[PDB]
């Protein structure tokens, strides 16, 4: 368990990059004598929030399409690569929307289109 | 399913904090349909008017715009007597401008706004649009009488 | 007074109506405009009367036909009338425009030129007639100077005059339907290209599309030379500003894709592109190619016919980039003469840097290109300077592209890795230092990856008795 698990980050193209880069450079500092949390702290060089809940009780991390949290297990994970929107979405809802549009072209497992709220380039990899 | 979540949020947000001079409730007669009301705008011939609307949210909403009719006859360049609205946000693009970024509240706002400022370039009533363009007074008079005939009680 | 022209038309032609013209004489504005404002269905019928009523056999029918036209152009424009009536009334003005003598249509076209100078062309639905009139002028080969000469000077005056910045695209969509010569299409499009400068960017792509579909019966050299010279200037100015990126990347791309869907149906388009982007002598390649020209080529590698041709050019040019510069950097005499134009690795890499905004077509070309260079110029002479260094340098590049590519595009870095392993594994038939040296620096930068590609390293180990030792070790 203490051994390295399978790991990855959901979120903003601009947010997720430095986590990946930091992970690559530090992973050798991983050590299976410690706990998973005690190793994460030193590998990713951060501390974790513990259920930041009551402050932002209607901030809407929700789909911004269906406006709901929790679509059939699925969670708002896919975001905008934009400082002014940051508007989360569902994989389901953003595919269903972007399929319709003229602007939207599909490569192999990816769809490029406009973010619904701000009309900036947003990428979806199925 | 995006229907269910949109309806739940928008219904209660419009029941507690709607935009001013606008109401929207789950039609009692038709609890799949909505009933909307626009109150007669100050400094308009629509002043002293309560304009009832049937607001149907298509089953693909919010990927498709609402289908909304005036139940109240209105004398307007861009709106015929049968209540049909010439407005891009009620149609999919490239012609229209609908997206789930917008909603029932913001489009009822764009409607009240058009009611304030008619756009003569999308004319449903060519007569009303030319009278609006050349003879403001006659339009304002016929429309205000229209408000007191159709939007009164 | 509308049901005293329905009767007139209901019986017979040019007998009572040609006189009914000379009786009224007042103005066909009240009889259409105010008649339209109430009920336009009348106007769709009415015009059937006047036109049958005013047959062009007589000049007092013809000047009554020349005025009703000058009217209903101006009423559909300035007038906020319905779409539905306009879809009819224009229908008529088209359907009847065929059988005119010469000097009236040149005057109608002069009205049209005057409108493109000034007039509020709030819909270019008004200019839907301007295609067919240049047709109907050309079919009458009689001296009014013949019809085709008048057409030539007329479209020269359309080009010479200023274009409504708003609907320049819609005007250029009209020369689509007319038959033209080379000189004519060239004049019209080089003006449509002068107009990219004085626009917003987001409308340049559809204009480029409507240029290309015109260029299908016109100049291609010119269309793509224009798009290339324009974006070449753009990217250089973006560079020296850095010494509007997040959308400059959308345009370059959308354009490459829009020119793709055309070279797809128009195999000659591709050949003219390629001829334009020849090295030939290396002095044309130091004025021709670009950081945009090359994203465009490395999208083009996806067309089945075209992959190969393209790559071969890039690769061979790549080498000269090394050979000019290498032979240049031997000597001071040469460094004195040439003002050093950025060289070809740099450019290819600036593509890769640009790439981030995720035009993911170019990538197939990169990866394809990259292993082409190393498979081509690998250490095998080594198990000179001339046949050594600009092949090692080439190899380095291959490697360099892919590693940088791997760093940026999370989507690809599965099939960079497999395509490496492939060449690593069964060989040591041929040397593979280079692939392991890359393989190092791939995995050194971001070795999370092999957690995602675990089946593939598992089935490199199932050859790790047959593999020679220095390989296995590393
Ligand atoms: Zn959703
Ligand atoms: Zn956004």
TrEMBL record, chain C:
<protein>
    <submittedName>
        <fullName>Fanconi anemia, complementation group I</fullName>
    </submittedName>
</protein>
<feature type="domain" description="FANCI helical">
    <location>
        <begin position="268"/>
        <end position="354"/>
    </location>
</feature>
<feature type="domain" description="FANCI solenoid 1 cap">
    <location>
        <begin position="1"/>
        <end position="53"/>
    </location>
</feature>
<feature type="domain" description="FANCI solenoid 2">
    <location>
        <begin position="362"/>
        <end position="474"/>
    </location>
</feature>
<feature type="domain" description="FANCI solenoid 1">
    <location>
        <begin position="64"/>
        <end position="264"/>
    </location>
</feature>
């Amino acid at each position: 368990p203490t051994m390295l698990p399978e790991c990855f980050f959901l979120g903003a193209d601009h947010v997720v990059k430095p986590l990946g880069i930091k992970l690559s450079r530090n992973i050798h500092l991983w050590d299976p004598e410690n706990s998973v949390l005690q190793n994460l702290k030193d590998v990713l060089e951060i501390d974790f929030p513990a259920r930041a809940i009551l402050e932002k009780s209607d901030f809407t991390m929700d789909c911004g399409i269906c406006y709901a949290y929790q679509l059939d297990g699925t969670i708002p994970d896919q975001v905008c690569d934009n400082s002014q929107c940051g508007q989360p979405f569902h994989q389901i809802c953003l595919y269903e929307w972007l399929r319709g549009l003229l602007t939207s072209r599909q490569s192999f497992n990816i769809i490029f289109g406009e973010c619904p709220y701000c009309s900036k380039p947003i990428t979806l990899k199925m | 399913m995006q229907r269910a979540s949109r309806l739940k949020r928008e219904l209660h947000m419009l029941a507690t904090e709607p935009p001013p001079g606008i109401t929207c409730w789950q039609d009692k007669d038709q609890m799949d349909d909505l009933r909307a009301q626009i109150l007669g705008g100050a400094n308009t011939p629509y002043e002293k008017g309560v304009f009832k609307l049937e607001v149907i949210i298509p089953e693909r909403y919010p990927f498709e715009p609402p289908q909304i009719r005036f139940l109240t006859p209105i004398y307007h360049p861009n709106i015929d007597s049968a209540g049909r609205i010439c407005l891009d946000v009620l149609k999919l693009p490239p012609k229209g401008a609908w997206r789930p970024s917008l909603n029932i509240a913001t489009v009822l706002t764009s409607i009240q706004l058009l009611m304030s400022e008619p756009n003569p370039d999308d004319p449903l009533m060519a007569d009303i649009s030319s009278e609006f363009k050349y003879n403001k007074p006659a339009f304002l008079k016929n429309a205000r009488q229209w408000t007191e005939k159709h939007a009164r009680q | 007074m509308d049901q005293k022209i329905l009767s007139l038309a209901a019986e017979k032609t040019a007998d009572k109506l040609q006189e009914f013209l000379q009786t009224l004489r007042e103005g066909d504005l009240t009889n259409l405009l105010q008649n339209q404002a109430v009920k336009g269905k009348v106007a769709g019928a009415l015009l059937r009367a006047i036109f049958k009523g005013s047959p062009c056999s007589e000049e007092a029918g013809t000047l009554r036909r020349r005025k009703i036209y000058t009217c209903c152009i101006q009423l559909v424009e300035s007038g906020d009338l319905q779409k539905e009536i306009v879809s009819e009334i224009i229908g008529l003005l088209m359907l009847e425009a065929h059988h005119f003598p010469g000097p009236l249509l040149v005057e109608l076209a002069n009205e049209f030129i005057s409108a493109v100078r000034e007039g509020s062309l709030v819909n270019g639905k008004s200019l839907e007639l301007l295609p067919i009139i240049l047709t109907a002028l050309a079919t009458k080969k009689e001296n009014l100077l013949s019809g085709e000469e008048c057409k030539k000077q007329l479209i020269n005056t359309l080009c010479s005059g200023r274009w409504d910045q708003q609907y320049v695209i819609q005007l250029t969509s009209m020369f689509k339907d007319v038959p033209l010569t080379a000189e004519e299409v060239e004049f019209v499009v080089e003006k449509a290209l002068s107009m990219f400068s004085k626009m917003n960017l987001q409308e340049i792509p559809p204009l480029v599309y409507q240029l290309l579909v015109l260029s299908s019966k016109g100049s291609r050299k010119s269309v793509l030379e224009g798009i290339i010279a324009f974006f070449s200037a753009l990217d250089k100015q973006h560079n020296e500003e850095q010494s509007p990126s997040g959308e400059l990347r959308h345009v370059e791309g959308t354009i490459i894709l829009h020119i793709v869907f055309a070279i797809k149906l128009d195999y000659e388009l591709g050949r003219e592109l390629v001829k334009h982007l020849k090295v030939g002598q290396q002095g044309d390649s130091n004025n021709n190619l670009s950081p945009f020209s090359i994203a465009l080529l490395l999208s083009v590698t996806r067309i089945q016919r075209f992959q190969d041709q393209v790559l071969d050019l890039l690769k061979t040019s790549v080498v000269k980039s090394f050979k000019d510069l290498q032979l240049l950097q031997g000597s001071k005499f040469l460094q004195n003469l040439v003002p050093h134009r950025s060289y070809v690795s740099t450019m290819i890499l600036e593509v890769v840097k640009n790439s981030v905004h995720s035009w993911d077509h170019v990538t197939q070309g990169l990866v394809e290109l990259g292993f082409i260079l190393m498979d081509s110029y690998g250490p095998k002479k080594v198990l000179p300077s001339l046949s050594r260094m600009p092949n090692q340098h080439a190899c380095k590049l291959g490697a360099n592209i892919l590693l940088e590519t791997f760093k940026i595009h999370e989507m690809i870095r599965q099939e960079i890795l497999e395509q490496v392993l492939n060449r690593v594994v069964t060989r040591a038939s041929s040397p593979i230092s280079h692939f392991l040296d890359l393989l190092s620096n791939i995995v050194m930068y971001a070795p999370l990856v092999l957690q995602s590609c675990s089946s593939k390293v598992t089935e490199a180990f199932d050859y790790l008795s047959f593999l020679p030792l220095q390989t296995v070790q590393r």
